[PDB]
């Protein structure tokens with residue numbers, strides 16, 4: 001087994017348990033609004049499970065030549081992110097009843113953020129690799145700027161419980177997402193300070209926090225039910 005195989009195994013298992021758990025809890029939820037939250041936050045770990053499973057199953061990796069060495073890049077994980085980051089932002093958008101314009105902008109930027117990062121990951125030219133990372137971080141910064149701007153995220157309209165859940169969920173999102181570029185930077189595709197193994201491990205831990213942790217936080221909320229948010 002390759003050093004990083006165990007963290008791909010861990011992620012697969014962890015996501016599968018989360019998917020099954022959320023799905024089970026949601027099966028008894030008949031509220032129209034809450035069912036939507038269960039739907040999105042069940043789908044997110046399901047996708048992660050499927051994509052990590054592909055890696056585990058010997059698909060979803062591409063080799064990229066870096067500094068004379070071949071790096072096994074998990075392209076399947078980028079395809080996961082490309083799908084789940086917009087869904088997670090859709091959850092935040094729904095919590096604060098954001099406009100269509102704002103929701104679509106967030107979703108767009110998330111997709112672009114991951115597309116750029118994946119382009120970076122597959123670049124053999126170090127200068128182009130950095131550039132793609134930089135452009136991706138700019139999309140991430142734009143997302144965070146939108147989330148943080150209190151004029152754009154009108155909260156005055158929310159019930160206390162709902163506002164609190166939003167604040168917690170937004171804080172978690174910003175804390176976690178901000179860490180992804182730093183792991184990338186320190187890993188084999190960036191500075192090469194941290195081995196691939198450690199990099200994979202740290203990403204799996206973020207992913208679990210970002211999907212399972214975030215899912216548990218929102219789904220355990222009293223504020224996702226009809227007439228409970230506004």
Ligand SMILES: *C/C=C(C)/C=C/C=C(C)/C=C/C1=C(C)CCCC1(C)C
Nearest residue numbers: 084117133136137140177180181210
């Ligand atoms: C469920 C998975 C989640 C929430 C993944 C989030 C991933 C990111 C925020 C990734 C960001 C990146 C950059 C801003 C720089 C380029 C490399 C990326 C794609 C790791």
